[PDB]
């Protein structure tokens, strides 16, 4: 009964990035914490220099990923990487062979690592098409839910 909790900024960052990349795939890293055996919090995400096509994406700059993580510490985000995200513009959420090779390298450093996939095309008002996965190689889907009063009043200011 394990759940991935995606903060508001994380969801908006991933959706905004997915839609901007269209018709290309995009990706980025996910910061968060493993609170307990049943709870993974994704508080934040960020995108590194990358190249993509309609059916692939890869990170280019690797210095950037290191640097960025120090900048955030300096500004109060002490959370570490819990996983990664990329987009499937138009063809749903699942893990490809390429994504498994990347996900297992993640799970080697943290057996609780997570891989999120969002579809910017199928995501529409009233239907957000996103999913979180992990391996054991086959893979399985983790339930996704969302956590605060401060964020909620702030969001209600739109309309």
């Amino acid at each position: 009964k394990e759940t991935v909790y995606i903060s508001s900024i994380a969801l908006l960052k991933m959706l905004k990035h997915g839609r901007a990349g269209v018709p290309m795939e995009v990706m980025g890293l996910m910061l968060g914490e493993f609170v307990d055996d049943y709870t993974v919090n994704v508080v934040d995400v960020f995108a590194m220099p990358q190249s993509g096509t309609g059916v692939s994406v890869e990170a280019v700059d690797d210095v950037f990923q290191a640097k960025m993580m120090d900048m955030l510490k300096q500004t109060g985000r002490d959370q570490m990487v819990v996983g990664w995200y990329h987009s499937h513009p138009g063809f749903g959420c699942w893990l490809s062979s390429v994504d498994v090779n990347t996900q297992k390298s993640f799970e080697q450093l943290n057996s609780r690592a997570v891989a999120v996939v969002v579809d910017p095309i199928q995501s529409v008002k009233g239907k957000v098409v996103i999913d979180a996965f992990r391996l054991i190689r086959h893979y399985y889907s983790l339930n996704i839910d969302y956590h605060t009063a401060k964020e909620t009043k702030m969001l209600m200011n739109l309309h």
Binding site: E25, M27, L29, M48, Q50, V55, S56, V57, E58, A59, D62, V63, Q65, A66, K67, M69, M80, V81, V82, W84, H86, S96, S97, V98, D99, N101, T102, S105, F106, Q108, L109, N110, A113
Partner: protein
């Protein structure tokens, strides 16, 4: 000599090496303790991506130095 290799996920790994070691062979020395292919490792130190050809003497990496491991990020 003892060095440290911290990852972006918080887990830190300790390695014992010698300054007469190529960056190509250091990545292999990482695959032994965690299983990550060298081709998927990107080594960073003092803002520099370590190149496989050079040695620790080219980067002046002394004992108890801290490296940072970034992974190859590939999605399809």
């Amino acid at each position: 000599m003892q060095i440290f290799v911290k990852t972006l996920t918080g887990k830190t790994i300790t390695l014992e090496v010698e300054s007469s070691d190529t960056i190509d062979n250091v990545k292999s020395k990482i695959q032994d303790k965690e299983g990550i292919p060298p081709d998927q490792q990107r080594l960073i130190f003092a803002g520099k991506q370590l190149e496989d050809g050079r040695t620790l003497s080219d980067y002046n990496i002394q004992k108890e130095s801290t490296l940072h491991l970034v992974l190859r990020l590939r999605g399809g």
